[PDB]
């Protein structure tokens, strides 16, 4: 729609203005149960020919269920926690005796109901399949006859539709061992997911967003195995709640800004360390340093608030005016002169320095731009591919207006070489005090001698 960014040249960085955050803030839990029967021995005399698929399918079912029975750059400032917290609590509640019996009894005919547990938790119950009816009505009257013989093989294939899903279940919990990301469609189909979105206590615009983005919430959601006793095998889905929806959230890319000093290895330079997503949730902003935890889909981002920074609303002030007396504005400084480039949503920012061939070319008119020196940035609808150093990259080709603001080489504000290049956590205040104290030390050394 109206995607934009303004590449600052004062500090070479991209701020992708214009998005809607759709942040998750809570965990919605729900128990999904399958009912299933303790089949005894097949009770068949002879082998026949028609009854071969049934016998091996049921043996596969027995093996599957007995196997399930036998089952039971700002990252250093980022924390760690238990993502599976509510669902394991619900399962541990279900470990109490006589609790899952209430689910079994209450959900006898209704597809979805609500039960209240021993700790005031009353989220939801749901039944995914009805193997009681099909097994006790369409299979066992036939398979347990004298000298058994099925009526036809066509009665078996619909059984496949009731069994293969379960088989999916088994080898997707024997591989990932209880916790599965993303949730497969065999735990929860798309239509059944649409049913469940119409069930949890959220407002209807959240329901519309989840219905429009079923695969995204399917990607984000978890699954945890609960108890298996009384043959009512079940699991808790921990699909995300979504607190704030539709506030601006920008992606800050950074690019190096290093002087093209003739003497190699003596070019000190300072580059922004603020990569990631900044969404203005409530009166503050939430910062995600991990771009992999966040996901993007058609202007619509989706990211997790557990590994989030509740940074104050004054982040745009340092974003516009980098030399402001209100924010720390963390910067990494080093003498490295590395030709590196990044791709924003509506452009490519190259920072190739020294002897490095730098070309922006399209497939229509051959080459169209050559980057000599300094940090440079091209709009997405100006170029197609960029070659820097020995590597090629491709800019995004989605519609949006992008502008380049004329900034300044801030690296020339400071001394040509006083900057230390052996620190990995620094801000403008700390670096400024380091420069002040080094200047004080050198004038003291000059005054004493």
């Amino acid at each position: 729609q109206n995607i934009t960014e303004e590449f600052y040249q004062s500090t070479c960085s991209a701020v992708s203005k214009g998005y809607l955050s759709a942040l998750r803030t809570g965990w919605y839990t729900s128990v999904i149960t399958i009912e299933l029967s303790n089949i005894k021995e097949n009770k068949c005399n002879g082998t026949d020919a028609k009854v071969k698929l049934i016998k091996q399918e049921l043996d596969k079912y027995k093996n599957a269920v007995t196997e399930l029975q036998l089952l039971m750059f700002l990252g250093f400032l980022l924390g760690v926690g238990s993502a599976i917290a509510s669902g394991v609590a619900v399962c541990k509640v279900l470990h109490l005796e006589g609790e899952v019996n209430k689910i079994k009894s209450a959900l006898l005919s209704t597809n979805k109901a609500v039960v209240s547990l021993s700790n005031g938790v009353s989220v939801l119950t749901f039944k995914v399949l009805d193997l009681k009816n099909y097994i006790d009505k369409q299979l066992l009257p036939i398979l347990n006859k004298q000298s058994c013989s099925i009526s036809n093989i066509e009665t078996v294939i619909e059984f496949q539709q009731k069994n293969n899903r379960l088989l999916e279940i088994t080898r997707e919990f024997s591989v990932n061992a209880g916790v599965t990301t993303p949730v497969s469609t065999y735990m929860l189909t798309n239509s059944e997911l649409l049913s469940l979105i119409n069930d949890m206590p959220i407002t209807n615009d959240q329901k519309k967003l989840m219905s429009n983005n079923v695969q995204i919430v399917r990607q984000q959601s978890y699954s945890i195995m609960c108890i298996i006793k009384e043959e009512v095998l079940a699991y808790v889905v921990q699909l995300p709640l979504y607190g704030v929806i539709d506030t601006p959230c920008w992606k800050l890319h950074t690019s190096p800004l290093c002087t093209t000093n003739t003497k190699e290895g003596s070019n000190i330079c300072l580059t922004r360390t603020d990569r990631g997503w900044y969404c203005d949730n409530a009166g503050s902003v939430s910062f995600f340093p991990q771009a992999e935890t966040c996901k993007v889909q058609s202007n619509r981002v989706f990211c997790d608030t557990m590994n989030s920074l509740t940074l104050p609303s004054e982040v745009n002030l340092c974003n516009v005016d980098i030399f402001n007396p209100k924010y720390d504005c963390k910067i990494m400084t080093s003498k490295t002169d590395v030709s590196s480039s990044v791709i924003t949503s509506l452009g490519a920012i190259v920072s190739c320095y020294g002897k490095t061939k730098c070309t922006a070319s399209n497939k229509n008119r051959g080459i169209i731009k050559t980057f000599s020196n300094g940090c440079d940035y091209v709009s997405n609808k100006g170029v197609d591919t960029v070659s820097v150093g020995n590597t090629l990259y491709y800019v995004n080709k989605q519609e949006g207006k992008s502008l380049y603001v004329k900034g300044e080489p801030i690296i020339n504000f400071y001394d040509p070489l006083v900057f230390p290049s052996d620190e990995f956590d620094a801000s403008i205040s700390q670096v400024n005090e380091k420069i002040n104290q080094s200047l004080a030390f050198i004038r003291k050394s000059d005054e004493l001698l």
Partner: antibody, heavy 126, light 110 residues
């Protein structure tokens, strides 16, 4: 020591829906399955209903279905029916009984009559 | 009320064999390996004597013998006793999710 003793019965008016109760002691209750049957003077035995462990898969006779409901409790371990729309033909003696060994829900495995009770006589009159 | 047809009464001398029977359809006592025979004295509880076509429970005499052929179950006794005046049933799982019974056969001695 295995026993089944019964509660309820007597003279019940036409209509007058009634809840009938078993009572059992001296063995495992939730482990096995209980069920009800009737027989009237002048004719033979007539099956009614069966339940399994917990309250699940409430089986019913084809000629009796709809007129009755069945449910069990795990605290007192006493099977409870409730029967409605009483006709003249329900004058009979009713028996709880026990069957099934493993944790199954299929009726073909549930056909053993391992023990029996004494039954309640119920008569309808005016 | 559909049931299984059975003799009203059979009379036999002591120390004689009887071969009483009940007959149904295919979706009945016919096959499916659910044949059961039961005895009951008046004012006493019914009792398992034959289950699962031929097998016998604990604490029962071996003179009883249950069998089946086609759509007909049969019970055979050996060495009739003056305690066998009772009423007898054949019970089996019908195909429509129910446990169907017989009409009751009176066994008497003379």
């Amino acid at each position: 020591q295995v026993q089944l003793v019964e509660s309820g019965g007597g003279v019940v008016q036409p209509g007058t829906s009634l809840t009938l109760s078993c009572a059992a002691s001296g063995f495992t209750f939730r482990t096995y399955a209980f069920h009800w049957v009737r027989q009237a003077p002048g004719k033979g035995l007539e099956w009614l209903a069966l339940v399994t462990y917990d309250g699940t898969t409430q089986y019913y006779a084809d000629s009796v279905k709809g007129r009755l409901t069945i449910y069990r409790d795990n605290s007192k371990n006493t099977l409870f029916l409730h029967l409605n729309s009483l006709r003249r033909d329900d004058t009979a003696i009713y028996f709880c009984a026990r069957g099934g060994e493993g944790s199954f829900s299929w009726l073909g495995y549930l056909q053993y009559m391992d023990v029996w009770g004494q039954g309640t006589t119920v008569t309808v009159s005016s | 009320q559909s049931a299984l047809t059975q003799p009203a009464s059979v009379s036999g001398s002591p120390g004689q064999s009887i071969t009483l029977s009940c007959t149904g359809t295919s979706s009945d006592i016919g096959d499916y390996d659910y044949v059961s025979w039961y005895q009951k004295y008046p004012d006493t509880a019914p009792k398992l004597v034959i289950y699962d076509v031929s097998e016998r429970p604990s604490g029962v005499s071996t003179r009883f013998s249950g069998s089946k052929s086609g759509n007909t179950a049969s019970l055979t006794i050996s060495g009739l006793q003056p305690e066998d005046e009772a009423d007898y049933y054949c019970n089996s799982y019908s195909s429509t999710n129910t446990l169907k019974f017989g009409g009751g056969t009176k066994l008497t001695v003379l």
